[PDB]
Amino acid sequence: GPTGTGESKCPLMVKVLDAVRGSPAINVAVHVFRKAADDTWEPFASGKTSESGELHGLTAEEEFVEGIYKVEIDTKSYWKALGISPFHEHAEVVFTANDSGPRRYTIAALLSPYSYSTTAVVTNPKE
Amino acid sequence: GPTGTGESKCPLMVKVLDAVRGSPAINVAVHVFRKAADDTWEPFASGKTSESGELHGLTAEEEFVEGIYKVEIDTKSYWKALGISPFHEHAEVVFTANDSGPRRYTIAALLSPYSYSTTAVVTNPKE
Amino acid sequence: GPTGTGESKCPLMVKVLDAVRGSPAINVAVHVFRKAADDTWEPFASGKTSESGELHGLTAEEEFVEGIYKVEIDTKSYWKALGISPFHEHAEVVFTANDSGPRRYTIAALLSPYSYSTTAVVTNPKE
Amino acid sequence: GPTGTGESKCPLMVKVLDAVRGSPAINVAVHVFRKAADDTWEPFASGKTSESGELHGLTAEEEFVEGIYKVEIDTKSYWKALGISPFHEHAEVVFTANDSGPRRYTIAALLSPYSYSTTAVVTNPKE
């Protein structure tokens, strides 16, 4: 099933949707990075979306400390897999994670060949 | 808890999000209509979004027959409730429901004061 | 400027884009209605987007009085003429206009088969 | 036309809009990078959006060669100057350009504090 660096009560979740087919975007590769002290993007977690277009178990709460994170979504592979030429090489979401703010982070991405929209839902409850 | 005309294995679900606060849009009124024989919008189901920004139990499968449906979202009340002047009177989603197509319908709406995006996810599994 | 029904400084303009092809949505039919005293939609103006995906000259400043307007974009025909059976019947934007004096409104829509985004840009004329 | 680094027919243009105020996003800093032979991002061009939310003259057609480019929009500064702590650090659009000959690219972004949409309009020059 879905997983990542550390499957636990998801502090970070990714949901990807397909605006052309009206369906979840399945088997889409997602790579998470953490900005290191030297400003380089340290690999953090990675995975592929499930049949429901979701990626959970990426990280556990112990290791999800405040910092700058980058979620890279391989949208090009996805569109190539459907016979459609896309515009973007990938879609990235860069944000800061702070403790004062709600605990859970859901990054949602809605995809089209020449356009993508992303939203963040920060909460306290589950999902 | 959440409900509507007939709470069952949700053939139709609504999910509303707030792009300004990064949270689900709670207590948002949603009215569903069915185009009648005389082309008027017959009231069909209605409700308010839950704490998770979702509305389920709107209809049951027996009564969700092929037809043209309209989902009206009272976005103006929502923004007025936050001290923000919105542009739209409401957001409507009009679509045809056909049996050949997947069984489940999830209408998602992402809201901002002067802009809204809506997507449909049509599937066979749950959600 | 252009009184009667022309377009003084063009108070109402529509811009449609295609998220699947990365281009303006050409020849999209647009119908505008104004809410009449009797609470019914009265035909106000109509046209089709140009090669640039824009629609100008829908109304003159003199006739564009305060009121509730509905801009209906025939998205279904557009996608069908491309061989795609889309989800929505059309896209509708309903808003109150000119309540605090005359303004210039630009309604933009970004189209995908199972999704659409709309935003409004409201300017205060200066000439 | 304008060779060197000006803008012949303006091959690269950025348009930024604000979904919370219903207006162009003025004075937004934009940085463009090109992927160098060594797989590192090299500074290619930069500027700020005008009162219309547009950024023109970033490059000339002669210097806008085939390559992978990254358009970085400083969304964080924009929202902060408005008193809002937004979710994202910035918005980045990465794409391959001019691989099948020269084209005109228009990168559009619609901004909200916890969300952004981006689309591309690619035109084939004729003059």
Side-chain angles (χ1 to χ4, degrees):
Chain A
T3 182
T5 305
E7 175 264 340
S8 304
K9 182 188 275 68
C10 291
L12 177 66
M13 221 282 272
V14 186
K15 218 288 165 53
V16 194
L17 301 181
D18 182 329
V20 174
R21 300 184 314 190
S23 48
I26 310 178
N27 287 115
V28 180
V30 181
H31 296 260
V32 186
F33 301 93
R34 191 175 186 267
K35 181 174 263 276
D38 58 305
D39 273 28
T40 53
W41 289 111
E42 174 213 87
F44 186 72
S46 71
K48 284 256 192 190
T49 55
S50 69
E51 288 290 313
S52 74
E54 294 156 7
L55 220 202
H56 298 78
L58 279 181
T59 178
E61 190 164 57
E62 236 322 291
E63 70 145 358
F64 195 38
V65 298
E66 301 183 292
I68 301 184
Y69 294 86
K70 169 164 109 176
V71 178
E72 183 157 67
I73 305 162
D74 192 359
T75 58
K76 198 190 190 183
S77 300
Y78 179 84
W79 291 113
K80 275 166 57 182
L82 274 41
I84 292 128
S85 221
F87 175 84
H88 303 96
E89 286 298 302
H90 51 253
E92 325 100 281
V93 183
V94 188
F95 61 100
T96 296
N98 290 132
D99 292 298
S100 59
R103 299 68 184 293
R104 212 273 199 273
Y105 290 84
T106 303
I107 303 298
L110 177 59
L111 313 179
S112 289
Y114 285 71
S115 182
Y116 72 84
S117 56
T118 182
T119 318
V121 186
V122 190
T123 63
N124 279 46
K126 237 74 72 173
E127 55 189 308
Chain B
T3 182
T5 305
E7 175 264 340
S8 304
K9 182 188 275 68
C10 291
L12 177 66
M13 221 282 272
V14 186
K15 218 288 165 53
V16 194
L17 301 181
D18 182 329
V20 174
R21 300 184 314 190
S23 48
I26 310 178
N27 287 115
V28 180
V30 181
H31 296 260
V32 186
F33 301 93
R34 191 175 186 267
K35 181 174 263 276
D38 58 305
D39 273 28
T40 53
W41 289 111
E42 174 213 87
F44 186 72
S46 71
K48 284 256 192 190
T49 55
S50 69
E51 288 290 313
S52 74
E54 294 156 7
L55 220 202
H56 298 78
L58 279 181
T59 178
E61 190 164 57
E62 236 322 291
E63 70 145 358
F64 195 38
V65 298
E66 301 183 292
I68 301 184
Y69 294 86
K70 169 164 109 176
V71 178
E72 183 157 67
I73 305 162
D74 192 359
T75 58
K76 198 190 190 183
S77 300
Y78 179 84
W79 291 113
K80 275 166 57 182
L82 274 41
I84 292 128
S85 221
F87 175 84
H88 303 96
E89 286 298 302
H90 51 253
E92 325 100 281
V93 183
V94 188
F95 61 100
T96 296
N98 290 132
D99 292 298
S100 59
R103 299 68 184 293
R104 212 273 199 273
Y105 290 84
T106 303
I107 303 298
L110 177 59
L111 313 179
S112 289
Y114 285 71
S115 182
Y116 72 84
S117 56
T118 182
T119 318
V121 186
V122 190
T123 63
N124 279 46
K126 237 74 72 173
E127 55 189 308
Chain C
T3 345
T5 182
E7 50 161 306
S8 289
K9 290 89 72 175
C10 231
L12 183 59
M13 201 250 277
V14 181
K15 214 275 193 296
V16 191
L17 296 177
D18 178 331
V20 173
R21 301 194 298 173
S23 60
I26 305 173
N27 233 253
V28 180
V30 178
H31 297 260
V32 186
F33 306 86
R34 181 182 176 270
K35 209 151 201 191
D38 56 10
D39 196 54
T40 66
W41 289 112
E42 290 196 328
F44 180 77
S46 68
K48 271 175 181 182
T49 58
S50 68
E51 299 306 288
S52 61
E54 311 187 334
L55 182 47
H56 296 63
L58 279 173
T59 182
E61 116 98 82
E62 270 297 272
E63 75 137 350
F64 192 38
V65 300
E66 169 169 13
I68 295 191
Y69 295 73
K70 169 163 61 166
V71 177
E72 190 195 275
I73 305 172
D74 183 12
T75 56
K76 197 177 195 188
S77 289
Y78 178 77
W79 291 114
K80 279 184 53 175
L82 264 39
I84 297 145
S85 335
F87 179 79
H88 310 94
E89 284 301 309
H90 47 66
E92 358 48 32
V93 178
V94 185
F95 59 104
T96 298
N98 313 308
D99 58 307
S100 320
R103 294 293 177 279
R104 295 182 188 155
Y105 298 85
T106 293
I107 306 294
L110 177 58
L111 316 184
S112 294
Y114 278 68
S115 184
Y116 69 82
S117 302
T118 186
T119 196
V121 180
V122 189
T123 288
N124 197 111
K126 178 188 179 178
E127 210 284 329
Chain D
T3 345
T5 182
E7 50 161 306
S8 289
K9 290 89 72 175
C10 231
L12 183 59
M13 201 250 277
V14 181
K15 214 275 193 296
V16 191
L17 296 177
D18 178 331
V20 173
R21 301 194 298 173
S23 60
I26 305 173
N27 233 253
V28 180
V30 178
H31 297 260
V32 186
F33 306 86
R34 181 182 176 270
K35 209 151 201 191
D38 56 10
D39 196 54
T40 66
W41 289 112
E42 290 196 328
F44 180 77
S46 68
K48 271 175 181 182
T49 58
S50 68
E51 299 306 288
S52 61
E54 311 187 334
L55 182 47
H56 296 63
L58 279 173
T59 182
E61 116 98 82
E62 270 297 272
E63 75 137 350
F64 192 38
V65 300
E66 169 169 13
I68 295 191
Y69 295 73
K70 169 163 61 166
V71 177
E72 190 195 275
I73 305 172
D74 183 12
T75 56
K76 197 177 195 188
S77 289
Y78 178 77
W79 291 114
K80 279 184 53 175
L82 264 39
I84 297 145
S85 335
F87 179 79
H88 310 94
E89 284 301 309
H90 47 66
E92 358 48 32
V93 178
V94 185
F95 59 104
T96 298
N98 313 308
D99 58 307
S100 320
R103 294 293 177 279
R104 295 182 188 155
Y105 298 85
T106 293
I107 306 294
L110 177 58
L111 316 184
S112 294
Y114 278 68
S115 184
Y116 69 82
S117 302
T118 186
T119 196
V121 180
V122 189
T123 288
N124 197 111
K126 178 188 179 178
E127 210 284 329

